[PDB]
Amino acid sequence: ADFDGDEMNLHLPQTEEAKAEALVLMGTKANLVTPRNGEPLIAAIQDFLT
Amino acid sequence: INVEIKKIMKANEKVTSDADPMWYLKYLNIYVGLPDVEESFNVTRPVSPHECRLRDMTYSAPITVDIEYTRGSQRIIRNALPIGRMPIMLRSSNCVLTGKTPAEFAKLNECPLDPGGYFIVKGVEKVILIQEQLSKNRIIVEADRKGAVGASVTSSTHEKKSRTNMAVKQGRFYLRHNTLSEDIPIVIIFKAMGVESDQEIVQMIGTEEHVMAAFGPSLEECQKAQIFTQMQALKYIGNKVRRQKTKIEEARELLASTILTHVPVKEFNFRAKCIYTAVMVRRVILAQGDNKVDDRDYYGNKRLELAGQLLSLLFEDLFKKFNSEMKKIADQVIPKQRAAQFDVVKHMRQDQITNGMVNAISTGNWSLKRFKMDRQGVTQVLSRLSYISALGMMTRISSQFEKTRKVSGPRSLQPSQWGMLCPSDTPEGEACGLVKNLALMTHITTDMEDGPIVKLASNLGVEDVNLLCGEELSYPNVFLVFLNGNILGVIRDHKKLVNTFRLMRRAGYINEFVSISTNLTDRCVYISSDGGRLCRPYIIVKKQKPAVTNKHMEELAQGYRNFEDFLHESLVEYLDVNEENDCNIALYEHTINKDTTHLEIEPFTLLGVCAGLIPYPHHNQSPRNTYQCAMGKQAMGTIGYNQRNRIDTLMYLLAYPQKPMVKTKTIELIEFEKLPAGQNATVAVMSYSGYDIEDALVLNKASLDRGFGRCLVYKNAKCTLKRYTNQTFDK
Amino acid sequence: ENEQVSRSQQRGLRRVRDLCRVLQLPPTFEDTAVAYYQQAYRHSGIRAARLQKKEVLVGCCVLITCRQHNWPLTMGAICTLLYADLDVFSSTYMQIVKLLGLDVPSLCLAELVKTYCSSF
Amino acid sequence: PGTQMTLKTFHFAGVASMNITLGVPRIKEIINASKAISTPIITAQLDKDDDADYARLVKGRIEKTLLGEISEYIEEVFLPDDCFILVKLSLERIRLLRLEVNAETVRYSICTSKLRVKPGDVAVHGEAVVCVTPRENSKSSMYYVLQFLKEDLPKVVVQGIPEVSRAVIHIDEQSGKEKYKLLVEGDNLRAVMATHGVKGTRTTSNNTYEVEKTLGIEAARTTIINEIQYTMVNHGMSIDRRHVMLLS
Amino acid sequence: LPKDVSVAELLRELSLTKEEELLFLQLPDTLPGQPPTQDIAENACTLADLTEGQVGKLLIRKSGRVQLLLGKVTLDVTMGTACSFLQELVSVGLGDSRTGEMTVLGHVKHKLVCSPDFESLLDHK
Amino acid sequence: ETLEALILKELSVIRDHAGSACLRELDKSNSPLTMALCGSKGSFINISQMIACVGQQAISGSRVPDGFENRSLPHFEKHSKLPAAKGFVANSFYSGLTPTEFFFHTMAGREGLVDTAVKTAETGYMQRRLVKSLEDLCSQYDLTVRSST
Amino acid sequence: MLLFCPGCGNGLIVEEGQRCHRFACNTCPYVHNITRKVTNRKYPKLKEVDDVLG
Amino acid sequence: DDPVVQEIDVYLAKSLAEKLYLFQYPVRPASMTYDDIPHLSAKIKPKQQKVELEMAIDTLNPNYCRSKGEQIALNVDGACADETSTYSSKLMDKQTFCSSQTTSNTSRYAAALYRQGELHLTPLHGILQLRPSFSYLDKADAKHREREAANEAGDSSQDEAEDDVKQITVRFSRPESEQARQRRVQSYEFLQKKHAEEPWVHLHYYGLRDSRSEHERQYLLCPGSSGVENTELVKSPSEYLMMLMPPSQPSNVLSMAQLRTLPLADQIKILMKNVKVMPFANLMSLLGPSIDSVAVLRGIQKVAMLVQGNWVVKSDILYPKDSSSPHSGVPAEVLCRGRDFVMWKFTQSRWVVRKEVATVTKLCAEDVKDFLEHMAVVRINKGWEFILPYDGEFIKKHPDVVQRQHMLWTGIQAKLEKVYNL
Amino acid sequence: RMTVGKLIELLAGKAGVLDGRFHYGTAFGGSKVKDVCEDLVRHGYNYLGKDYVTSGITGEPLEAYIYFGPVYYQKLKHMVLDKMHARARGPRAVLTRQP
RNA sequence: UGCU
Ligand SMILES: Nc1nc2c(ncn2[C@@H]2O[C@H](COP(=O)(O)OP(=O)(O)OP(=O)(O)O)[C@@H](O)[C@H]2O)c(=O)[nH]1
Ligand SMILES: [Mg+2]
Ligand SMILES: [Zn+2]
């Protein structure tokens, strides 16, 4: 994203099992790296590196 | 509405039925009149475009005609009879807005700065975009699907349009047409078109060693068969002809009229057509070597059809349909109705043409069966997001492709768009490269008579093509001269011809819009006089000094002369793409060298209307300018001085709009400063609070409270209370 | 429907629509005219009638549709565009109105005045 | 990675020629495993990688050489006794290109899939002269077939593999030593490996179908993996080898 | 065979040799004259309307210019398409309504084209 | 092609030398330079393009093709292979770009835009196919990857 | 080469008569006996020595 | 570049104007001629010229195949019919050259015979291209068709008397529609039949080697003196140009030429309505020196007034009676009064105050700005100054005009003082 | 993005609002940078747009100068109030029972 | 038709 008018979707699970699976498997703290080559994608960005 | 409608009426002036001879319906003169509304009870009343928008009706004028017919063998005439309603374009010759001052515009509830030029039907504003297609009656040499370098020609006359191709799939030239069962050799067609001597055929094709070596296989394949006479060739063509000596007659008819319709034959004299196919085969042979393949994206071979030609074709088709319906009704009524003599007035449908035009302008889908043309998206809703948005949408251009394939060829920016179309203005998305906008300074030519052009060409020593054989076509100094795809003849020392033609055009005896180009690779001088061609004004430069001077500019500023006087005094002239391809142009005065023929008027005119708002665009990137134009097409601001009385389904206005501080000459010209679409704010480039990480910005609470950025959204909610068939109404 | 219809009724409907489009009356007027024509054709006396009878029926249905909306239209022009004579026109008009009994609003004077003044 | 790649150009792999399809189109062709691919590349090693003479020799051996490309002139001479086509081979250019082609080799190449010309029709008079005297076949063909012979004779293969179209000598200038290899834009790996002087043990090809049909399914898998890895590295983006291994 | 020019052609036809030669020149559609008592109109004036005698002069200036002074205006004569095929000039005179005579006058080798000097016609007025 | 390659090499050398000179003359504390050093956004290439000189406008990995007959624009002589006539941009964004340079830059930009537009759909289709083909495999407990069957 | 009949102009083919090979047309009795040697060279472009790449 | 030498004369001949034709062979090079080929006859027509030459070719030459000649003769003709034979003997002896018409009109083409010091021009009555025609093949095809028919009929040894009486198959001469009749008229068969309807004319051939050739070659010349002034061919270059190119048939819509083509009064009126400020010398220079100064003065005095030596267009000329203010919509009379007041203020003093003018005329700022810009410019710290300087030359040259303008301005001042109550 | 045109526009607008003028940003021309720098140095402001600015939060001056100036910002029709969406159960389609 |  670039915060230039992007419309993003937000969904709310309707089941406790689905909620737990989303929190565990799709956790932001657990998916800090991509399975392509293991490089971290969630890191510093412009206005933070500088 | 002034000339083309009259020409169509003259072409379809007389209509009669086969049964009951001596009966006819003759049209004398057709009128469009002024815009009126059929609201009152059989009474006309002037109606304004704003009133039409408010009442959700069409802004059209009653089409009337004076006719004469024979009811019972007694000629009865009518001086004024309505037959339809033609939607009148705003700011046209017959529109009520033209020739009006701002005070009268205010009285009529219309903005003076409104660009106009759009139709109003059922309350919605539709604009007919400019269609961009390929030039007709032109040979195109290109690679085939598998990669066979062949040629094609789409001969389009006022009646039929036929595309015929020529391939070298097997080392020999096979001609393919939609009316033949199988592609036949070109030598058989040569023998059928009168020229039976193989020596003459080879001399017409060419006298070069490689030309003969490449054409040998065709002669061998022709000699393999027993085809040596015109009769045998025509019999073979007839046997190969598809169903729609009788076969020989049909073959001759297809060779004379169907194949290469643009090449005329005086009386079954195929000399011109033979020379044309010989030149085509010569071009194909020359291209079979060095890969000098012509490109389709070259706008010098493009034609722009404005709304005028589309409306003329639609009106012609509707008038033909009406004539056919009237003839059918007559054939059905007159022979068995009663002794009461029948006349057309009782069945003259006055709503046919009206509904046809209304649907063609509203739905946007045009289906002309007489020409087999099925187009869509011709008309689009005028975007009233802002004055800039409307002014930029009014000058758009759609392509014939219409997102068929991601070719990238026509979508790429070709150097031929110099001074004609805006390079940076293009919608960002799937339509990138297919939707374009005209430049700030450009013009579209119309059709001329072509009489004096041919007369001057014949008087300048152009030798008749029928007087000499085709061997002269293979000489290096003999240059062919073409006129709108038709072989005008041959000439020697084409420099003198071009110079004299340009001098005559500058003098004024020839229309300034007739273009003349010369291609040396093929040795062809093209004289273009058809409409739709893009032209641009240029100052004439002679001997390292332009013709326009400070004295002329001072006279223009004081009002002694005008642009027409400049055109007449051989100071500024219109150049086409094909003409500038050969002529040399200079950007500035310091760039003028010895080899210069013209001078650029202004460089900033290269950009379009939407791009003219960019301050200092030559200091930014191209994608930046593209996104800037795309967002200016949606910018929020005032629309016009009648924005309060205007009622649209969705409108966005700004509370305190302010004109830019850094305004461009294009802005001053388009008068955007009078209707700005933004505000100037004291911006500080810096990072603050980290809430502006990726393209975001931080606003001031107090600034927003003091009225900065205040916007107004106006929506419309419409309701209808109509009466049904029964005597009941919604209440 | 549209299948249990005779060629004569279809010709009558097409003539109604043609005269409506010639007079340039709205599609609501066209619908009302075709509806009244069907309602009149329902009867057998008008069903098995003369050709001039059914032509005057088309004319009178158009006239009734024009009157029902307070629209001025002269019976003279109606007869002129209908290929009929005033005598038989009035006779069949009286017959059909006595057979049906539909509302016949009187012709307003001001509307006809405006319609005729627009002609000059 | 398909979206990350921008489909750049000018990536000739250091040869400044032989435009090869790399990127999303190449990945598409690989995942489709088409029998015929666009611009196939075969890389072959040499036993004598330092001798440019031997490199050229094997190049001429593997590359298709047409008759018209080596013959200096072909003339259809009609002597008052008989008509025949005389081809003059340029022995100078032959020895310059280092092609083992003589009059006997040209005669043997002729009479192969050419309207069934009998051996007695072709004859040799000098050291570099070839005389072809056709005969009427009676199948809608008469003595006037010398034109078809002039049309299709110069395009007859005399030496090299018919499938090979263009073989070039690539050079690796490693500081240790400058070695030579063969880059063939053909679709025949079996013939390239069978040719003399080519180290068939270190011959690779880009056509997965040919690699499968020649060296087996494991060779095809290895070639697919290597090609995908190379195509992905050309764009500067890396992928774990396990993904391509699982795909293959 | 190098492409010759009209001035050198006339020079080598008159000075280098004295044998007569048959030429074929293409004149403009309308000549700068009026049909003399031909019942009119500004119509086309061709050679069929003019009478016999001296009608114009042929001048050869320096630098290879070849002009034709046919009155107050001056046309320019250039070399036409170099025809290499056989061209036989013949006169077919039908002296009698039943029998005529075809007389081969000579052969045509060179072709000339006369064109109005539009530049001069424009700069004059 | 040899002349083309030599001209491109000369232009690249000029570009690199101009960029090096700009980087050596620029003083520290400069915001563009600091951002290019830290890698947050921008780079030395963009800095040199917007300060020192813009690089050669390359279309499909080559110079601007001749749109007109034997020349890109009518403003240049025929058969002219000069850098400024074939696509070289001598001026920088700060000093302003000439009309021809701006037109060539717009050509390159539109080329890149259409390339990305085609790439979007092409990679979408490729990803759809690859996923529909590989959505059946899974890692079992016995360390053996098996399909659905 | 490509030869044509001076009489009609059609292509001439090489055939064998009763005395010597001759050019003849397929649409007229015109013929032309061969007296001396006749040749038609084409000089096909030779394959240049492709130099090493790199 | 002067005519140093080669001053050749041009003469015209009309002896063979209607008897001169141009025959050219596109398939025969100029090297080989038909002077040695014996000709037999030539078929021609007066109208729709299409000549067909019938020549003879040798047979004993080595370039002729006797077997193929016999074959083609037996194919085109019968065994011994010889009633309608394309060849007298059993060999191809005659050759047929057909003529094709290049153009309909050949008046622009002329044959030029060059002699020592003179060039004789003779018009051409027709130009035709001669090419070897192939009709013996069509006749052979017809012969083969009739032979196949005869074979089909004689398939049996003895053919019984066939009862194939021709029933009366008289079809209707149906009335052909106009479209079908036009199609039939434009069909190739109809044109061919119309051309064939005209009878042929046979002519003998006289080669160049004959004495008749040199006898008739002299008719291309004309008896006349060396120097004769032609009565015709005396039109000027402008007349020749008009002949060879005959014609087809804001307030600045009219161009300079369209303006000059109008009367002097309309010219001056349009120039004033366009510029609104121009000296008399500039007006004279624009109109032209051929127009009289008194006429220009009489024309300008009716549509302009004198202000500080310069001429300013009147207010009513710019604002007609039916016009109105494009910014406020006030009637044209008020605009005329305001413009007259502005002109009076300018004549009284070179510096005019916009605020004072507005306060006096009670007009709006935009109208005052337009009135001031029409005839003045903005000067800092001084207000509005007249765009042109004081022209005293015209005042000194025309004193009576100055007095007339002064009294007119006095009357206008009286009217303004009466209206605005100054 | 190499948007030096934005900086040039900002400097020109600052000079214009200071000197009571309207600078021109005409393509391939317009007011040069030297003219606006002269205007700024005549009016007393920095010739590069950067001015001494004090932080409002901490009240201490910033180590680097801030680039202030008037820029012509234009608001677009894309509104978050219109683009915001939240779907409960809501209705469904007749053919396929889905939102 | 626009948006990312
Ligand atoms: N606002 C808007 N306008 C559209 C839309 N789709 C089509 N139009 C109009 O229709 C034209 C092109 O639409 P098309 O893609 O041809 O319509 P389509 O091909 O049927 O698109 P599909 O419905 O996806 O097949 C445009 O140029 C618009 O005129 C749309 O989705 N939104
Ligand atoms: Mg985004
Ligand atoms: Zn022949």
Side-chain angles (χ1 to χ4, degrees), chain F residues 95-107:
Chain F
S95 60
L97 306 183
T98 60
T100 61
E101 298 167 354
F102 180 86
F103 193 95
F104 302 146
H105 189 57
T106 307
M107 289 173 60

PDB file of all heavy atoms in Angstrom, chain F residues 95-107:
ATOM      1  N   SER F  95      17.365  22.429 -14.619  1.00  0.00           N
ATOM      2  CA  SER F  95      17.519  23.411 -15.682  1.00  0.00           C
ATOM      3  C   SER F  95      16.368  23.383 -16.678  1.00  0.00           C
ATOM      4  O   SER F  95      16.227  24.323 -17.468  1.00  0.00           O
ATOM      5  CB  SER F  95      18.839  23.180 -16.422  1.00  0.00           C
ATOM      6  OG  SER F  95      18.881  21.886 -16.997  1.00  0.00           O
ATOM      7  N   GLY F  96      15.549  22.335 -16.661  1.00  0.00           N
ATOM      8  CA  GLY F  96      14.435  22.226 -17.584  1.00  0.00           C
ATOM      9  C   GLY F  96      14.761  21.372 -18.791  1.00  0.00           C
ATOM     10  O   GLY F  96      15.882  21.416 -19.309  1.00  0.00           O
ATOM     11  N   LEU F  97      13.787  20.593 -19.254  1.00  0.00           N
ATOM     12  CA  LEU F  97      13.966  19.701 -20.390  1.00  0.00           C
ATOM     13  C   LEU F  97      13.393  20.337 -21.649  1.00  0.00           C
ATOM     14  O   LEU F  97      12.320  20.945 -21.617  1.00  0.00           O
ATOM     15  CB  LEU F  97      13.290  18.351 -20.135  1.00  0.00           C
ATOM     16  CG  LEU F  97      13.695  17.635 -18.845  1.00  0.00           C
ATOM     17  CD1 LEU F  97      13.006  16.283 -18.748  1.00  0.00           C
ATOM     18  CD2 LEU F  97      15.207  17.477 -18.759  1.00  0.00           C
ATOM     19  N   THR F  98      14.117  20.192 -22.756  1.00  0.00           N
ATOM     20  CA  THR F  98      13.662  20.726 -24.026  1.00  0.00           C
ATOM     21  C   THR F  98      12.425  19.966 -24.503  1.00  0.00           C
ATOM     22  O   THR F  98      12.071  18.925 -23.947  1.00  0.00           O
ATOM     23  CB  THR F  98      14.773  20.635 -25.070  1.00  0.00           C
ATOM     24  OG1 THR F  98      15.145  19.265 -25.259  1.00  0.00           O
ATOM     25  CG2 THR F  98      15.991  21.431 -24.626  1.00  0.00           C
ATOM     26  N   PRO F  99      11.734  20.483 -25.522  1.00  0.00           N
ATOM     27  CA  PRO F  99      10.539  19.779 -26.023  1.00  0.00           C
ATOM     28  C   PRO F  99      10.807  18.351 -26.468  1.00  0.00           C
ATOM     29  O   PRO F  99      10.055  17.443 -26.093  1.00  0.00           O
ATOM     30  CB  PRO F  99      10.087  20.667 -27.189  1.00  0.00           C
ATOM     31  CG  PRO F  99      10.585  22.022 -26.843  1.00  0.00           C
ATOM     32  CD  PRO F  99      11.902  21.801 -26.162  1.00  0.00           C
ATOM     33  N   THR F 100      11.857  18.124 -27.260  1.00  0.00           N
ATOM     34  CA  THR F 100      12.140  16.773 -27.739  1.00  0.00           C
ATOM     35  C   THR F 100      12.503  15.844 -26.587  1.00  0.00           C
ATOM     36  O   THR F 100      12.075  14.683 -26.556  1.00  0.00           O
ATOM     37  CB  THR F 100      13.264  16.806 -28.773  1.00  0.00           C
ATOM     38  OG1 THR F 100      14.458  17.324 -28.173  1.00  0.00           O
ATOM     39  CG2 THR F 100      12.876  17.680 -29.957  1.00  0.00           C
ATOM     40  N   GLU F 101      13.298  16.333 -25.633  1.00  0.00           N
ATOM     41  CA  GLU F 101      13.663  15.514 -24.482  1.00  0.00           C
ATOM     42  C   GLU F 101      12.434  15.156 -23.655  1.00  0.00           C
ATOM     43  O   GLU F 101      12.285  14.010 -23.213  1.00  0.00           O
ATOM     44  CB  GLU F 101      14.693  16.251 -23.628  1.00  0.00           C
ATOM     45  CG  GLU F 101      16.004  16.532 -24.351  1.00  0.00           C
ATOM     46  CD  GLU F 101      16.886  17.514 -23.605  1.00  0.00           C
ATOM     47  OE1 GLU F 101      16.433  18.066 -22.580  1.00  0.00           O
ATOM     48  OE2 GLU F 101      18.032  17.738 -24.049  1.00  0.00           O
ATOM     49  N   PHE F 102      11.542  16.126 -23.435  1.00  0.00           N
ATOM     50  CA  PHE F 102      10.317  15.845 -22.696  1.00  0.00           C
ATOM     51  C   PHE F 102       9.447  14.839 -23.437  1.00  0.00           C
ATOM     52  O   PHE F 102       8.840  13.957 -22.821  1.00  0.00           O
ATOM     53  CB  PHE F 102       9.547  17.144 -22.451  1.00  0.00           C
ATOM     54  CG  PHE F 102       8.258  16.951 -21.701  1.00  0.00           C
ATOM     55  CD1 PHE F 102       8.245  16.917 -20.316  1.00  0.00           C
ATOM     56  CD2 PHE F 102       7.060  16.810 -22.381  1.00  0.00           C
ATOM     57  CE1 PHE F 102       7.061  16.743 -19.625  1.00  0.00           C
ATOM     58  CE2 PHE F 102       5.874  16.635 -21.695  1.00  0.00           C
ATOM     59  CZ  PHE F 102       5.875  16.601 -20.314  1.00  0.00           C
ATOM     60  N   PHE F 103       9.379  14.950 -24.766  1.00  0.00           N
ATOM     61  CA  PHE F 103       8.586  14.003 -25.540  1.00  0.00           C
ATOM     62  C   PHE F 103       9.163  12.597 -25.446  1.00  0.00           C
ATOM     63  O   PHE F 103       8.417  11.622 -25.307  1.00  0.00           O
ATOM     64  CB  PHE F 103       8.509  14.454 -26.999  1.00  0.00           C
ATOM     65  CG  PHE F 103       7.468  13.730 -27.803  1.00  0.00           C
ATOM     66  CD1 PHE F 103       6.205  14.272 -27.977  1.00  0.00           C
ATOM     67  CD2 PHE F 103       7.749  12.504 -28.383  1.00  0.00           C
ATOM     68  CE1 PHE F 103       5.245  13.609 -28.714  1.00  0.00           C
ATOM     69  CE2 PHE F 103       6.792  11.836 -29.122  1.00  0.00           C
ATOM     70  CZ  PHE F 103       5.539  12.389 -29.286  1.00  0.00           C
ATOM     71  N   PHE F 104      10.489  12.472 -25.512  1.00  0.00           N
ATOM     72  CA  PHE F 104      11.114  11.157 -25.377  1.00  0.00           C
ATOM     73  C   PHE F 104      10.893  10.586 -23.981  1.00  0.00           C
ATOM     74  O   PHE F 104      10.657   9.379 -23.824  1.00  0.00           O
ATOM     75  CB  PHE F 104      12.606  11.251 -25.690  1.00  0.00           C
ATOM     76  CG  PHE F 104      12.910  11.792 -27.060  1.00  0.00           C
ATOM     77  CD1 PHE F 104      14.032  12.575 -27.278  1.00  0.00           C
ATOM     78  CD2 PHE F 104      12.071  11.521 -28.132  1.00  0.00           C
ATOM     79  CE1 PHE F 104      14.313  13.074 -28.535  1.00  0.00           C
ATOM     80  CE2 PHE F 104      12.351  12.017 -29.391  1.00  0.00           C
ATOM     81  CZ  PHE F 104      13.473  12.795 -29.592  1.00  0.00           C
ATOM     82  N   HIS F 105      10.963  11.436 -22.956  1.00  0.00           N
ATOM     83  CA  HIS F 105      10.704  10.970 -21.599  1.00  0.00           C
ATOM     84  C   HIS F 105       9.265  10.498 -21.450  1.00  0.00           C
ATOM     85  O   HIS F 105       8.997   9.490 -20.787  1.00  0.00           O
ATOM     86  CB  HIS F 105      11.013  12.083 -20.596  1.00  0.00           C
ATOM     87  CG  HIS F 105      10.990  11.634 -19.168  1.00  0.00           C
ATOM     88  ND1 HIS F 105      11.782  10.608 -18.698  1.00  0.00           N
ATOM     89  CD2 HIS F 105      10.276  12.073 -18.107  1.00  0.00           C
ATOM     90  CE1 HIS F 105      11.554  10.433 -17.409  1.00  0.00           C
ATOM     91  NE2 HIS F 105      10.644  11.311 -17.026  1.00  0.00           N
ATOM     92  N   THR F 106       8.322  11.210 -22.073  1.00  0.00           N
ATOM     93  CA  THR F 106       6.927  10.780 -22.033  1.00  0.00           C
ATOM     94  C   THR F 106       6.737   9.467 -22.783  1.00  0.00           C
ATOM     95  O   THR F 106       5.946   8.616 -22.364  1.00  0.00           O
ATOM     96  CB  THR F 106       6.025  11.867 -22.619  1.00  0.00           C
ATOM     97  OG1 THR F 106       6.288  13.115 -21.967  1.00  0.00           O
ATOM     98  CG2 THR F 106       4.560  11.504 -22.434  1.00  0.00           C
ATOM     99  N   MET F 107       7.451   9.290 -23.896  1.00  0.00           N
ATOM    100  CA  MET F 107       7.401   8.019 -24.611  1.00  0.00           C
ATOM    101  C   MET F 107       7.875   6.881 -23.719  1.00  0.00           C
ATOM    102  O   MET F 107       7.224   5.831 -23.628  1.00  0.00           O
ATOM    103  CB  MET F 107       8.253   8.096 -25.879  1.00  0.00           C
ATOM    104  CG  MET F 107       7.675   8.982 -26.971  1.00  0.00           C
ATOM    105  SD  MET F 107       8.806   9.203 -28.359  1.00  0.00           S
ATOM    106  CE  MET F 107       9.018   7.511 -28.910  1.00  0.00           C
TER     107      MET F 107
END
